[PDB]
Scaffold this motif. Structure first.
Motif, short mmCIF file in Angstrom:
data_model
loop_
_atom_site.label_atom_id
_atom_site.label_comp_id
_atom_site.label_asym_id
_atom_site.label_seq_id
_atom_site.Cartn_x
_atom_site.Cartn_y
_atom_site.Cartn_z
N UNK A 156 133.11 33.81 -20.09
CA UNK A 156 134.18 34.42 -19.33
C UNK A 156 134.66 35.72 -19.95
N UNK A 196 146.00 25.43 -22.21
CA UNK A 196 145.17 26.32 -23.03
C UNK A 196 145.63 27.76 -22.91
N UNK A 197 145.92 28.22 -21.69
CA UNK A 197 146.38 29.59 -21.46
C UNK A 197 147.39 29.64 -20.30
N UNK A 254 144.53 36.03 -23.74
CA UNK A 254 143.74 35.84 -24.98
C UNK A 254 142.26 35.96 -24.67
N UNK A 289 135.19 22.78 -23.21
CA UNK A 289 136.49 23.14 -23.77
C UNK A 289 137.24 24.23 -23.02
N UNK A 290 136.59 24.85 -22.04
CA UNK A 290 137.25 25.88 -21.22
C UNK A 290 138.34 25.30 -20.32
N UNK A 291 138.09 24.12 -19.79
CA UNK A 291 139.01 23.55 -18.81
C UNK A 291 138.87 24.26 -17.47
N UNK A 292 139.99 24.43 -16.77
CA UNK A 292 139.99 25.24 -15.56
C UNK A 292 141.33 25.80 -15.21
N UNK A 293 141.29 26.94 -14.51
CA UNK A 293 142.48 27.61 -14.01
C UNK A 293 143.04 26.83 -12.84
N UNK A 331 139.07 33.98 -10.76
CA UNK A 331 138.98 34.17 -12.21
C UNK A 331 137.53 34.26 -12.62
N UNK A 332 137.29 35.12 -13.60
CA UNK A 332 135.96 35.26 -14.20
C UNK A 332 136.06 35.62 -15.67
N UNK A 377 148.04 28.34 -15.00
CA UNK A 377 147.63 27.87 -16.32
C UNK A 377 146.16 27.53 -16.33
N UNK A 378 145.53 27.67 -17.50
CA UNK A 378 144.19 27.13 -17.73
C UNK A 378 144.40 25.81 -18.49
N UNK A 379 144.03 24.71 -17.84
CA UNK A 379 144.41 23.39 -18.28
C UNK A 379 143.21 22.62 -18.79
N UNK A 380 143.46 21.74 -19.75
CA UNK A 380 142.46 20.87 -20.32
C UNK A 380 143.00 19.43 -20.40
N UNK A 381 142.20 18.45 -20.00
CA UNK A 381 142.59 17.05 -20.16
C UNK A 381 142.69 16.63 -21.64
#
Lengths: 110, 110
Positions: free
Chosen positions: A7, B38-39, A43, A105-109, B109-110, B10-14
């Protein structure tokens, strides 16, 4: 087999006549083709590299950009990306290396 | 028929055991279930509303969150979202209204 994500950290929109009209309305003194940078993630390669919202990305590694799908493909396939950007009356070159995240580890938006 | 996008930014992670181990390593003095932030995107409901990276989202409208897919579904279906967040030793409540963009103006997003 690890899930990978490459990304650069922008939310991108294809330049269309509709969009060009809005941009003309806001910035009358200022580009009919390219990728508009709607947002930059904090970031990210794009933030670190100097890309800013409102930027229009017009070439990648010397190739013209007309549709967001083309930039998606470049992010997936090339590293780094030499991105030609129009910022108002300025013409800028950035070298933006896509960040790679492994293991999902990116997850998703959202 | 207009293409719609609802988003909170947000960029989310479980949260998984793997992730909990990393978080313990960094923050030994500080949660085994939820959604990790995450972000946070800069011009978003989450930024405006006070959510910060590192936050863990544990409930939405009183319902427990264990998987990112559940938060995706809430963003798609409910408005606003009363989000319960763990931030270190603090327990916080935010009311985050998903922003709606029409006509495919969200891009991607990219």
């Amino acid at each position: 087999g690890s899930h990978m994500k490459r990304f650069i950290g922008i939310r991108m929109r294809t330049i269309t006549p509709s969009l060009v009209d809005e941009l003309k309305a806001s910035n009358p003194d200022f580009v009919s083709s390219g990728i508009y940078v709607q947002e930059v993630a904090p970031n990210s390669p794009s933030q670190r590299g100097g890309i800013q919202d409102g930027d229009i990305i017009v070439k990648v590694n010397g190739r013209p950009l007309v549709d967001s799908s083309e930039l998606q493909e470049a992010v997936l396939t090339e590293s780094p990306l030499l991105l030609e950007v129009r910022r108002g009356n300025d013409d800028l070159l950035f070298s933006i290396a896509p960040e790679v995240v492994m293991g999902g580890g990116f997850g998703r938006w959202v």
